[PDB]
Amino acid sequence: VHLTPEEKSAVTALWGKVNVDEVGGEALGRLLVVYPWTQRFFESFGDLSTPDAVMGNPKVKAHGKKVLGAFSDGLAHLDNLKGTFATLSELHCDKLHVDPENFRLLGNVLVCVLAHHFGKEFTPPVQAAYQKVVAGVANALAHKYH
Amino acid sequence: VHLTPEEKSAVTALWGKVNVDEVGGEALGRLLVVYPWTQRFFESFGDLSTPDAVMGNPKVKAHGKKVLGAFSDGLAHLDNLKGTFATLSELHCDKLHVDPENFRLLGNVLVCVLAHHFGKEFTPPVQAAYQKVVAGVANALAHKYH
Amino acid sequence: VLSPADKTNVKAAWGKVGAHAGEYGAEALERMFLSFPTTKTYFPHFDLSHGSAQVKGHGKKVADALTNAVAHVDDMPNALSALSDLHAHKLRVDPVNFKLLSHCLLVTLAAHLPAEFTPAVHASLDKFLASVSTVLTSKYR
Amino acid sequence: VLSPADKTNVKAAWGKVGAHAGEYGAEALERMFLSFPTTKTYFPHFDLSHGSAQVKGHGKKVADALTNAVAHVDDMPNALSALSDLHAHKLRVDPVNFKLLSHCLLVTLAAHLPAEFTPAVHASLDKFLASVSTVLTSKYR
Ligand code: HEM
Ligand code: HEM
Ligand code: HEM
Ligand code: HEM
Ligand SMILES: Cc1c(O)cccc1OCc1cccc(CO)n1
Ligand SMILES: Cc1c(O)cccc1OCc1cccc(CO)n1
């Protein structure tokens, strides 16, 4: 993806304040609630019967932390998102057969969570930069489909 | 690249029986009628007020031939769709900014048109083989988005 | 949202299907399973072999539900409440799969009813199947 | 299709907006224009620079429409028939653009109303905006 130097600074600054224990879990969580069909991929995650059950689920929080860690690796390697997510793409595409649309949904859900956590600090230009990043990440994960 | 030997054979065998002067117009025409927001991309094409106007529009049929010619070029280079549609990808993505989903819709409209013409001859295995074709064409056309 | 003409087109076309309901329903399913093999994962305990009796039985179930939807085109949510409690609540079907089946249904209709499958009726049927898909994929209980 | 709970969630959440209608609507537009530049092609005659009085006033129009949609959540096609003719018949907006704006509306609400933006309400709001989008992109007259 292509960020301006000002955009990269704003992205890095905000990301350094991200609660790495919760933000990922809330992102994956809201995905499973807002788009319930995504729950099918996580049968072994125990109780997902209610919104509260999903948000509070330790396996959801744990796995969401791995998702967030993937985005962190993406941010640290924006010049090579395809090579960075090559392993994950082979997993999500060849094995799990996740629809590429769901990749975009999660990226946008993360954006909502960031807005939720930072309020007015998540300005429209800040969002604009993060939309470039999540589009690049989601595109990197669907790379084995291409 | 995908397509099995047997799928390549089924696609080639049917395409030789295809009316290259009508199918394209029918496909583009139905795209404009079934998904009316696509008409916005063809404002200079004249009367698009009714289904009868669309299907009888000379420019729509003419452009349909061009579109179908590109599909034909794709079928002759099934192991290199992304190179075949490289130039068109720049046009549709970078210049026209056509959303990728519309690429998939046109491909499936084409599939319906093929079924409409061949009927019983358009068997499930034949359709299945053509589904991989139009998906590969849609992906190749959205290459500049990736 | 369907226009009066949309409702007119759907009723006239699906009415022409008639007793071929179970046949077209089964064919549409078989087209889906073959063109998009991932959809088979929703039927793990099914006999999805070619021409199997279970698939033809299921096709008739799908077709009749569609016939029911056509009769209640002005009131789909209520008429389809049960189908939306086992597609959206328990099977949690990904809406992309409904687009796949809806397509295969159009392909099947186009293959069997050439004179009926006009561009206008094509467009109306697509909207109808999209409406049914929306209702069955939504949690409104 | 919205549940009774969806409708309750939407009314409560949007009721908190109140006097911030124009501000939130305008912000949502700015977010869409900046995040997704291709959406600007629908507004070539508009002043789209930041702080634009035109965007500000138009944001108020969009917000009031949403408020009206909340009021007629059970009667959207008739209440929104006006905006449908504009967006579907005249403007012919690609449905993907409605998804982008809906997303930017959610982001705006999350940024301004963190206490309201629960996962359940998030879901209901998304379905509501998806519903409004379907009506405005459907030619049903
Ligand atoms: C869009 C951005 C996404 C990112 C960055 C991401 C990231 C990850 C990561 C880091 C893992 C861990 C893999 C490992 O430890 O070997 C993983 C696994 C997984 N992902 Fe994703 N993911 C994304 C989207 C999705 C979506 C949308 C779905 C489903 C709707 C999904 C389904 C899964 C499943 C089922 C697993 C393995 C779960 C298990 O091991 O039980 N992913 N993902
Ligand atoms: C999916 C397969 C598609 C193929 C194979 C295809 C093929 C073509 C070809 C061969 C041309 C001629 C380019 C030239 O001669 O310079 C063209 C132009 C064009 N295409 Fe496509 N196309 C596809 C999809 C679409 C879709 C879905 C849209 C809009 C929703 C679209 C919009 C256009 C427009 C607006 C032009 C130029 C029309 C003009 O000259 O006024 N295309 N396309
Ligand atoms: C127009 C679209 C659809 C209609 C009208 C429809 C209708 C039906 C009907 C009538 C049943 C049987 C209900 C019963 O046995 O009481 C059923 C079951 C089922 N459907 Fe669908 N369906 C549609 C789309 C889909 C799609 C796209 C999928 C998956 C890709 C799907 C997956 C299933 C599954 C897994 C069952 C349960 C079968 C069993 O476990 O015995 N449906 N549907
Ligand atoms: C999603 C919910 C939306 C709502 C509630 C909404 C609402 C409105 C309203 C109330 C108006 C003014 C109508 C009047 O003149 O009284 C309007 C106009 C307009 N809308 Fe939307 N809209 C939505 C989505 C969109 C999207 C996604 C786009 C394009 C990306 C769009 C493009 C336009 C344009 C180009 C105008 C005309 C502006 C002018 O020249 O005055 N709308 N909309
Ligand atoms: C009207 C419409 C579309 O043009 C496309 C997708 C869904 C849709 O509406 C679905 C729906 C929801 C609630 C009630 C009814 C009519 O019974 N339809
Ligand atoms: C109920 C629903 C969804 O969960 C998602 C998209 C559209 C949708 O319905 C749209 C619609 C069409 C016609 C009438 C009404 C209710 O006024 N809604």
Residue numbers in the entry:
A (entry chain B), B (entry chain D): 1 to 146
C (entry chain C), D (entry chain A): 1 to 141
Sentences from the paper on this structure:
To ascertain whether VZHE-039 binds as predicted, we determined its crystal structure in complex with liganded Hb in the R2 conformation. As expected and similar to previous aromatic aldehydes (e.g., INN-312, TD-7, and SAJ-310), two molecules of VZHE-039 bound in a symmetry-related fashion at the α-cleft of the Hb tetramer with the aldehyde moieties forming Schiff-base interactions with the two αVal1 N-terminal amines. The benzaldehyde ring made both intra- and inter-hydrophobic interactions with α2Ser131 and α1Thr134. The Schiff-base interaction directed the methoxyPy group toward the αF-helix residue to make moderate intrasubunit hydrophobic interactions (3.5–4.5 Å) with the helix. The pyridine rings also showed extensive 3.7–4.0 Å π-π interactions with each other. Consistent with our design prediction, VZHE-039 made novel and strong hydrogen-bond interaction with the αF-helix using the methylhydroxy moiety. In the VZHE-039 structure, the methylhydroxy forms a strong hydrogen bond interaction (2.9 Å) with the backbone nitrogen atom of αMet76 of the αF-helix. In another structural difference, the benzaldehyde hydroxyl moiety of VZHE-039 (which is absent in TD-7) is engaged in a strong hydrogen-bond interaction with αVal1 nitrogen. Most likely, this interaction may have led to the differences in the positioning of the pyridine methylhydroxy moiety in the two structures, which in VZHE-039 allows close interaction between the methylhydroxy and the αF-helix.
Under hypoxic conditions or in areas of low partial pressure of oxygen (O2), HbS becomes deoxygenated (DeoxyHbS) and polymerizes into long and rigid fibers, causing sickling of red blood cells (RBCs). While the primary interaction between HbS that initiates the hypoxia-induced polymerization process and the subsequent fiber formation occurs between the pathologic βVal6 residue and a hydrophobic pocket on an adjacent HbS tetramer, the stability of the fiber requires additional secondary interactions between the HbS molecules.
